[PDB]
């Protein structure tokens, strides 16, 4: 089997991407944030504290003839950005782009933090990291991909995120028309539960490539590119007037600037992030100070190849017995 679904930016800045997901019988379609940095499929629901729902579409398990309460199971998650959610668990039928899993754990939120409430466009998350990170207790549950894997034509999924445009998540096949040149594959460590790999270096604009190992995670659920302070300083030094602002929470730059590109290495291959991808717009409405899309990972504890990086590539998440990651230009 295979599946193919379009993923759409939630706003004009590509702050996140949503993908429609069918849950239950009859189908209830929710728009979920596909997150290769976590491993829980959780949804706003009829059980979510009413004051914490503000415009989201909810899953109502009592209206699904295939929903079953997973007795005694609870979940609770906290994300790198400080947000969180928790609740109980159902199993139900879940379909993505024509690919169906029966008995998928659907984690129903009883509580969500303010950032989730405040984002009306995201109805929940669909985790695509390794199932070892799943938070369901006392019996850990499998991700949608893990459940689908054995049925897929090939044990892979691909992320093809657009810049200010829709893109695609495919399951079970590689669309050879969706990228240019070849896909370069690179080793993955699953030791921390992430799609963790080592980039071979970077360049700023038309500058020379610096060969240096950068360990980090391919994370579709993180907006920006978070790299070591040395790398980030080298980037922003090429933008007149750019500075790190403690008050704002990172590097800012004059909105009148033209940003240089940023290149990262995948083995001997190179992925070029155009400068415009690194512009996240005014820090507040009407400001001429703009927020940068490349930020320091110092004090995160891990480098994160988020959407800024991934949307410059066609990315293969290869879930073979020994997982790997593939990157192609597009």
């Amino acid at each position: 089997s295979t599946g193919s679904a379009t993923t759409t930016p939630i706003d004009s800045l590509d702050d996140a991407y949503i993908t429609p997901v069918q849950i239950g019988t009859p189908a209830q379609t929710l728009n979920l944030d596909f997150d290769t940095g976590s491993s829980d499929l959780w949804v706003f629901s009829s059980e979510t504290t009413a004051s914490e729902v503000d415009g989201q579409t909810i899953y109502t398990p009592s209206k699904s003839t295939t929903a079953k309460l997973l007795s005694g199971a609870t979940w609770s998650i906290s994300y790198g950005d400080g947000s969180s959610s928790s609740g109980d668990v159902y199993t139900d039928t879940v379909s993505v782009g024509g690919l169906t899993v029966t008995g998928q754990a659907v984690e129903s939120a009883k509580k969500v933090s303010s950032s989730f409430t405040e984002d009306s466009t995201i109805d929940g998350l669909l985790g695509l990291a390794f199932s070892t990170l799943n938070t369901v207790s006392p019996t850990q549950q499998k991700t949608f991909f893990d459940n689908a894997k054995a049925s897929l034509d090939s044990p892979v999924f691909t992320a093809d995120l657009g810049y200010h445009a829709p893109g695609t998540y495919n399951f079970g096949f590689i669309d050879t028309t969706a990228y240019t040149g070849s896909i370069t594959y690179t080793a993955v460590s699953t030791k921390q539960g992430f799609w963790e790999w080592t980039s071979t270096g970077y360049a700023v604009g038309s500058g020379t490539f610096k060969s240096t190992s950068i360990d980090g995670i391919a994370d579709t659920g993180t907006t920006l590119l978070y790299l070591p302070a040395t790398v980030v300083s080298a980037y922003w030094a090429q933008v007149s007037g750019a500075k790190s602002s403690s008050s704002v929470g990172g590097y800012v730059f004059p909105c009148s600037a033209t940003l240089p590109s940023f290149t990262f290495g995948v083995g001997s291959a190179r992925i070029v992030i155009p400068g415009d991808y690194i512009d996240f717009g005014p820090i507040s409405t009407g400001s001429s100070s703009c927020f940068g899309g490349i930020q320091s990972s110092a004090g995160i504890g891990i480098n994160i190849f988020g959407d800024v990086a991934l949307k410059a590539a066609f990315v293969v998440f290869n879930g073979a017995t020994t997982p790997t990651l593939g990157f192609a230009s597009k």
Side-chain angles (χ1 to χ4, degrees), residues 23-62 64-67 69-109 112-141 143-148 150-170:
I23 309 175
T25 310
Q28 299 178 41
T29 299
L30 274 65
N31 296 327
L32 305 187
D33 184 350
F34 282 24
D35 180 14
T36 63
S38 70
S39 307
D40 288 49
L41 192 175
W42 75 260
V43 297
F44 279 79
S45 76
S46 55
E47 301 177 329
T48 310
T49 299
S51 61
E52 298 179 352
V53 185
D54 188 5
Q56 296 81 10
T57 295
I58 65 166
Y59 169 59
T60 302
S62 66
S64 172
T65 57
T66 41
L69 179 70
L70 185 62
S71 181
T74 60
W75 63 280
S76 180
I77 193 164
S78 304
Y79 297 101
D81 68 352
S83 68
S84 64
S85 53
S86 60
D88 52 22
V89 187
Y90 293 82
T91 55
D92 210 339
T93 301
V94 172
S95 300
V96 177
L99 170 65
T100 300
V101 168
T102 58
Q104 175 63 46
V106 177
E107 303 172 32
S108 171
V112 303
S113 66
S114 59
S115 63
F116 288 115
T117 299
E118 288 160 3
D119 187 356
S120 70
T121 72
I122 292 175
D123 302 325
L125 268 64
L126 189 150
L128 292 167
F130 293 86
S131 294
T132 54
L133 294 181
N134 177 267
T135 76
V136 176
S137 177
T139 307
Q140 188 170 66
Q141 300 295 302
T143 70
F144 176 81
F145 178 55
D146 212 338
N147 282 323
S151 298
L152 294 179
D153 291 358
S154 181
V156 306
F157 68 92
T158 65
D160 180 10
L161 303 179
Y163 167 66
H164 293 355
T168 306
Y169 281 103
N170 291 328

Side-chain angles (χ1 to χ4, degrees), residues 194-216:
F194 300 124
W195 292 92
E196 187 172 1
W197 64 290
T198 302
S199 171
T200 48
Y202 70 97
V204 176
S206 61
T208 63
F209 187 83
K210 175 71 168 183
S211 292
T212 185
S213 297
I214 305 170
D215 296 341

